[PDB]
Structures are given as structure tokens and as C-alpha cells.
Amino acid sequence: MHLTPEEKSAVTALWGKVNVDEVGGEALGRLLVVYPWTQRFFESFGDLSTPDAVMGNPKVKAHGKKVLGAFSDGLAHLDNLKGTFATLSELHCDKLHVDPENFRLLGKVLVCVLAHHFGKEFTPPVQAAYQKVVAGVANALAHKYH
Template sequence: MVDWTDAERSAIVGLWGKISVDEIGPQALARLLIVSPWTQRHFSTFGNLSTPAAIMGNPAVAKHGKTVMHGLDRAVQNLDDIKNTYTALSVMHSEKLHVDPDNFRLLADCITVCVAAKLGPSSELHSHPYRITDSNYGVSRSSGIRLSLPQEYDGKAATARGS
């Protein structure tokens, strides 16, 4: 069980209230399938995933992206019982579908980028003490986009900013 502080609960619920799950879900799943193409093996029934344009226009990708985000909405609605909320879903993804747990981190990264692109810079999230950053991957996942290539990619940190 996670013990959330009042500030954490407020930040989670406040941010979630700004997100359109039906918009972000399809974008995030499409991004995952494009930037991490090995994840496509779990979606063989989705039809044409051969190009970024095909993925972005694929109705099955959009539908499942919405399903994923509505699943995350269940977590926000059940912050005190996330573990039990996701038990059956966890078993299905690990034991039946054999999804690598790292794929969920990759999807979370894609969701974060899509949310950041939609919401833009936010002083509230930039100053939040629990802002997520991951220097190992050269990505700062706060509300404003700041993507960097890992140093080993080209020998120096290259930063690209977008909105």
C-alpha cells in the first residue's frame, strides 16, 4: 500500500483532472509502438503497424490507448488500494501475455511526454519536490518537455526543447 501525503494526492488528482484520457491514450500508445517497435509483438491483432503513419491512424491502437488511460483513471480513483485494483490486470499482463515489466516504464515515459506536450510548462509541476527525472535516460519528465540524448549516444548531452 502506498501512503500518499495530502500534497501528493492533490498533485495527482489535480494533474489527472487536466488530462483528456481519450486524447492522450492513443497518442501515448502510438508513440510507444513507434519509438519502441519491439513492443509491437504484443499487438499482432491490431493490423497494420508498419509505419508511423499507419500506427497513428490505426483505430485499434487508438482504442487500446483509451483503454489503458481509463485503467490509469481507476488508479487515481483508488489511490488507497492500487495494488488490489490492479491484481487481475497484473496477472493477465505478466502470466498470460508475458509483457516485459520494462514496457510499462516505456509506456509511462510516452504518457509523460504526451501530457507535457499538451499541458506545456507548469511552474507548479516544475517546483514540485516529487517531479520525476531520469538522468540515466537523459529525460526530464516534468510538465515541460526537455528531452536529452544519453551521453553515450554521441559523447555529449544534446538537448532538444519543444512544446
């Protein structure tokens, strides 16, 4: 994945401030609240009936941490997203049966959460760099589907 020197710098600088635990639970929780059909993959997580229930669900918080942790390691390998995520791509297709459109929804929510958390520091050019990155990761995760 090709980013300009300015884009890569903006991405890495912001991420150094991200607490992956906190942001990861927030991003997955909002996904389940804003786009409730995504709850179809998480029937064993318990109570997802209301926003307050989703956002305080410890299984949601845990999974969020796992998901953004893996996203985090991808940011260290921006020039080969496909190779970095190949195993997880196969896992999501063959074992979990996750429609890759969900990866794009999560990207949208993640950008909203970064904007919410960082306010004015999340400038239009920083967002633009993050949009390239979330699209690259979604494409990488979808690549081994068949």
C-alpha cells in the same frame, strides 16, 4: 502508495483536464513508435509500419483508451495500487505474457505526452508527482508475476 498532500493534489487536478480517449491513443501510439519492439504484442492490430500509420490506427486508439481508462481508475485508489491491479497483473503475466519492463516504458511515454499536451503547466514538481505514480502503477501491475 504514499504521496504528500501537495503531490496528490497536483496529480488529481491535472487529471481532471485529461481526456483519456485522446491521451490514451497518443500515449500507446508513441510507445509503438519510440520503442518499436513493443509492437510484438500487437501483431493483429494491422499496419504499424510508420508513425503516421501507428498514430492513425483505430485499433491502437481503441486499446489506448482501454489502457488509460484502467490507469484512470487506479488514480482513484492511490493507497492500494496492488489490490486495485491484482487481477490485471495476473492477466498480463499468465495470459498475455507481457514483460513488465513495458509498463515502465509506457510510464515514460505517458509523462512525455502530458508535458507535450499541457506545456508549462506541467511543472517540475507536477512531473515529480506523476513519476511516483507511474512507477507505483508499473510496480502494481508487475506484482503478481511469477
